[model samples]
Target: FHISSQQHEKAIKSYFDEAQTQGVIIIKEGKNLSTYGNALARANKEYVPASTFKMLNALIGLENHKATTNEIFKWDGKKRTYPMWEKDMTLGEAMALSAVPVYQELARRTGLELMQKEVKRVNFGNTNIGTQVDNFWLVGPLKITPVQEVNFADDLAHNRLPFKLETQEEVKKMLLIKEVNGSKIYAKSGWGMGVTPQVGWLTGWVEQANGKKIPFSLNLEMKEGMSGSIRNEITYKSLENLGII
Candidate 1:
């Protein structure tokens, strides 16, 4: 038997009902659990995957050793505020910084040829690898919907991914936000400004003590100088509304 999370849905739905901006958020409870909010928009409409692609990028990098767990990128004497990004950082370190250049470097290393093959392997978004090697995901013709995001995460969470489960297993560790209120939060937040209606993305799933996972993805239009972290803030609130975390 299945149960409807009325209390959960209400708490989450109202958040969007009262939000200042317009966008979509999708939460998938499980294979058979539930979904909340913009159920159709989450599936139909597409948006750039933005930095969330890092999730897949990290996996591809590790799988082929194009990027290694021990891989490190030293700051190119570029100035930045984040102390962490200003210095050399390994794969884990770069992931933490959400360092664009480091991942861009990986993409260059992966090259259009392999990147195209892997993206097609997983059927990521439109899987359109345009001409520019480095900027394809950033400003090229690629896009994906929120529903697709959860489905991919489900694959990773369930060991159904094409790569060695061990690789995904370790990458999952890098995405963990915390363990709280009975579920571990594994997520990545992304922001893209290269296109119109700037986008912020937060993709996550909750892993219960029983191994049941509830994956979710949230994307919202962003304004200049606005915080990209707000994407997760909104998603977290929805999770709170749904009584997940």
Candidate 2:
């Protein structure tokens, strides 16, 4: 259930060495401690933000008072109604589940200008919301580097949001999970496209043993037909090896 620093390093190296992945980035102690391949390669450049952008959207909702962690919204079943009926979900639940329709609605209610302002406030890539709330603008078309992700994770942990303390607490509550040792870990994953390739992401931060914190962000860009389940398994295994799961 625990790993020493040496074991953690060896495990990460072996994992990446044997991985059929395109790139990997690991941060410890607020720095890029390890990297594999041209993880800095422009060929492995930014893709759509995918579900990972939900973190930013959640932050926007919290910062602007548009929504709260426990706030509820009705899922009217209009978006994708075949399998289930309308249901209500809280903002926290929405982020936890990566509910797309809920976020689309949130973006709509918050409107483009407000969302753009907050997106820029956080430096969450470009500020354009595209032609419509349902378009790829708010989330996609914008790009992020693994390095940028680490920076964002650090900012979130340090309460550097463009908001007051109370609002920042709400944002933190929505993204972070407290471990058994009472350390907080905040994280999000994203999956999207590339030039004839499929990509995935796991970007966040971990509270280290000494009470210092470290940010961890990864981008996995592979061939167009890679299995999501496999990528998830790899990420989970990596986190398990790091004793962060």
Candidate with top TM-score is 1
- Can you give the TM-score per candidate against the true fold? 0.89, 0.77
Q: Residue by residue across 135-191, what tens digits does model 2's lDDT show?
A: 463345566666667677777777776667777667667676446465556777766
Count of clashes, each model: 0, 0
Backbone clashes in candidate 1 total 0
Candidate 1: segments with Cα more than 4 A from true spot:
1-10, 33-35, 38-42, 80-84
Model 1, position 20, has a per-residue lDDT of: 59
Location of the lowest summed lDDT over 10 successive residues in candidate 2: 35-44
Question: Whole-model lDDT for model 1 versus the true structure?
Answer: 0.76
Query: lDDT tens string, model 1, 80-114?
Result: 64666778887676776788878888888888889
C-alpha RMSD of each candidate structure in angstroms: 2.7, 4.1
